[PDB]
């Protein structure tokens, strides 16, 4: 399929949505709730781009690139002013209740939420009211739980239930009091629960085994191994 991103013509696969098509081409669109393995649900509303149906169109319409197919003849703008302000506003809304926790967070320097806050260019706080807090659960010896850092992107529950087939992780709560975890305390008995520390874009689910002797990602010496 042929799409037009910011006036530039691109050849994409028409069976993919606009987010993975644009991320494949190297175009940076912010996103939280979409994962390549899980699918598209349109939750976080972070992947907004301005869509036009014609080459001669001025108004457009803010759509979700993860929920919009990459059909032939779509003219989308990523760095349009309205789309950038909406993505910055989504980051700001996620930043209203987020705790001042980055130094004492195991996901600091490896955080998707940090990267997307920096990418949208939001660095000034106008919210002056209180931030909601949450209690934490004991998830066993492997996964450490810190519920205050959640952005309600539903990646954890989607992976753990619709992909791994687990039965003890879920969404609870309400309007802005959404909780993600177990109905009680106990060990996550899924054999693939360790992928939650990389599925979660925030520092809610963290590696407790790494948290015992913790260093940042830049301090790590890596190797490819089996």
């Amino acid at each position: 399929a042929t799409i037009h991103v910011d006036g530039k013509e691109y050849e994409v696969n028409g069976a993919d949505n606009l987010l993975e098509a644009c991320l494949s081409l190297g175009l940076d669109i912010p996103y939280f709730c979409w994962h390549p393995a899980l699918g598209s649900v349109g939750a976080c509303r972070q992947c907004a781009v301005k869509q036009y149906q014609n080459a001669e169109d001025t108004r457009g319409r803010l759509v979700m690139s993860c929920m919009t197919p990459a059909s032939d003849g779509t003219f989308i703008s990523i760095d349009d002013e309205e789309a950038k302000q909406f993505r910055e506003s989504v980051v700001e809304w996620l930043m209203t209740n987020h705790p001042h926790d980055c130094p004492v967070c195991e996901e600091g320097g490896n955080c998707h939420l940090q990267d997307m806050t920096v990418m949208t260019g939001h660095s000034f706080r106008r919210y002056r009211f209180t931030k909601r807090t949450h209690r934490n659960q004991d998830l066993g010896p492997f996964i450490s739980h810190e519920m205050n850092r959640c952005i309600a992107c539903y990646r954890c529950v989607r992976y753990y239930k619709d992909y791994a087939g687990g039965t003890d992780l879920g969404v609870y709560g309400a309007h802005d009091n959404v909780y993600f975890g177990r109905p009680e305390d106990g060990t996550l008995e899924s054999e693939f629960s360790g992928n939650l520390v990389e599925i979660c874009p925030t520092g809610v689910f963290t590696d407790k085994t790494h948290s015992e002797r913790y260093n940042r990602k830049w301090d790590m010496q890596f190797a490819p191994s089996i």
Binding site: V41, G42, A43, C44, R45, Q46, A48, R61, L62, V63, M67, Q85, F86, S89, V90, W93, L94, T96, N97, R125, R126, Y127, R128, F129, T130, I151, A152, Y154, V171, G173, A174, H175, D176, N177, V178
Partner: protein, 439 residues
């Protein structure tokens, strides 16, 4: 007020002593005859076509065409498992019309659901009813039992050979359950998060099956169409919206209530001739046409016909046509604070802008109510209204949430500016660090 069957196709069979009408009395005064004609003389396709040519729009508030919605179910015969759902939630503030429809006329809803289930070839029907309507639930169950025993529900209905089973699913008290896809999710025993469309419920709805969700008042309009004809239905009022709508004014008026009026009647006729106007010593300041999720309108908008396109052209929505009047004694900042508190606490939490921006508007309005507003708060509210509009959020709870806020800022800005008393201060002084003083 006198209600002939011609101009009052819904409320003419209401009793003066406000008791429910049961099967013998309902069938005495021309009951279940439209269902008889539908099930003995017409194919489902021509019934759908009759509803389409009747111009019956959706009475839930959006005004979508009912026949066009019915025509969108798949035409192949491989899927014989089909569902018809009656959205008896009616959780919107200012809305009390479905309560009147099902508390005193349950057999009308049963007959309309039977007609619409035969038209859609829907093998099962569920009345998704809110938990607060208790006597409505009792009346609906008793009417269902009476119709089941008297050869109208169950197996081989009226000798045709059509099987239809009707159930009442009593809800558990959440406002978002009235959204049709969230209604489907709640019917499947899940959390009532709405779903993205496409796919629409007509192709894959409840349990992956073709499913049609309709309001109570639409299914109460359908038996009058199938009984008294289509041309009679198009000749009720000389307006682009065919049929009669349950309209009415509520809130500090002389006679608040609910009356069946044809489309095109102006809101002033409802306020003075039916509602009686404002009460003693009270003046008129504003009004809301379609419940809590509609734009506020002023006194100059009162001489406006109550159609979808007429109210829509004047920067509002017809909604459920149950208008609510705001007097001069009501502070509009407090009213919008109450509205936003309801809309924020009845969020489902699926998508970011509603979930994490409606409480921001709530806290801004709490600050403005107490006089602790700071500069930039009204601009923040305007930006929230712009960034919570249609298409920005996953469902339509949040655009309807933010419509009263932008309407109040547009029409009554001087009340919002009066709550800004203290200067803007987000930071506190850290001793040893000179702050950056931006200009």
């Amino acid at each position: 007020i006198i209600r002939t069957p011609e101009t009052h196709p819904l409320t003419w069979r209401l009793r003066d002593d406000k008791q429910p009408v049961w099967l013998d009395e309902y069938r005495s005064k021309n009951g279940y005859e439209g269902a008889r004609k539908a099930l003995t003389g017409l194919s489902p396709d021509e019934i759908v076509n009759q509803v389409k040519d009747a111009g019956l729009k959706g009475r839930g508030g959006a005004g979508f065409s009912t026949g066009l919605k019915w025509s969108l179910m798949p035409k192949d015969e491989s899927m014989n498992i089909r569902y018809l759902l009656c959205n008896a939630d009616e959780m919107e503030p200012g809305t009390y019309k479905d309560r009147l429809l099902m508390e005193q006329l349950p057999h009308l809803l049963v007959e309309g659901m039977l007609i619409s289930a035969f038209a859609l070839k829907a093998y099962r029907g569920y009345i998704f009813l809110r938990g607060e309507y208790i006597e409505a639930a009792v009346n609906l169950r008793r009417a269902i039992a009476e119709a089941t025993e008297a050869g109208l529900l169950g197996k081989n209905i009226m000798g045709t050979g059509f099987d239809f089973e009707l159930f009442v699913h009593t809800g558990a008290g959440r406002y978002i359950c009235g959204e049709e896809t969230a209604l489907i999710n709640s019917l499947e025993g899940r959390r009532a998060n709405p779903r993205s469309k496409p796919p629409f419920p007509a192709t894959s709805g409840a349990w992956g099956k073709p499913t049609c969700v309709n309001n109570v008042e639409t299914l109460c309009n359908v038996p009058a169409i199938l009984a008294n004809g289509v041309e009679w239905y198009q000749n009720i009022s000389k307006s682009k919206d065919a049929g009669t709508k349950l309209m009415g004014f509520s809130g500090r008026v002389k006679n608040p209530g609910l009356w069946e009026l044809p489309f095109g009647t102006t809101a002033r006729e409802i306020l003075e001739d039916y509602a009686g106007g404002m009460r003693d010593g009270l003046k008129f300041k504003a009004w809301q046409p379609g419940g809590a999720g509609t734009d506020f309108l002023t006194e100059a908008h009162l001489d406006l016909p109550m159609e979808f396109e007429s109210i829509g052209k004047a920067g509002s929505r017809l909604g459920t046509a149950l208008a609510m009047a705001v007097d001069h004694e009501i502070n509009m900042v407090s009213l919008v604070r109450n509205l936003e508190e309801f809309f924020a606490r009845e969020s489902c939490g699926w998508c970011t802008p509603c979930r994490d921006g409606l409480p921001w508007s709530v806290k801004i309005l709490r600050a403005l109510e107490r006089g602790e507003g700071q500069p930039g708060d009204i601009e923040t509210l305007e930006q929230l209204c712009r960034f919570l509009g249609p298409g920005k959020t996953f469902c339509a709870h949040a655009p309807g949430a933010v419509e009263p806020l932008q309407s109040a800022i547009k029409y009554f800005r001087e009340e919002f500016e009066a709550g800004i008393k203290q200067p803007f201060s987000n930071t506190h002084l850290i001793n040893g660090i000179q702050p950056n003083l931006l200009k």
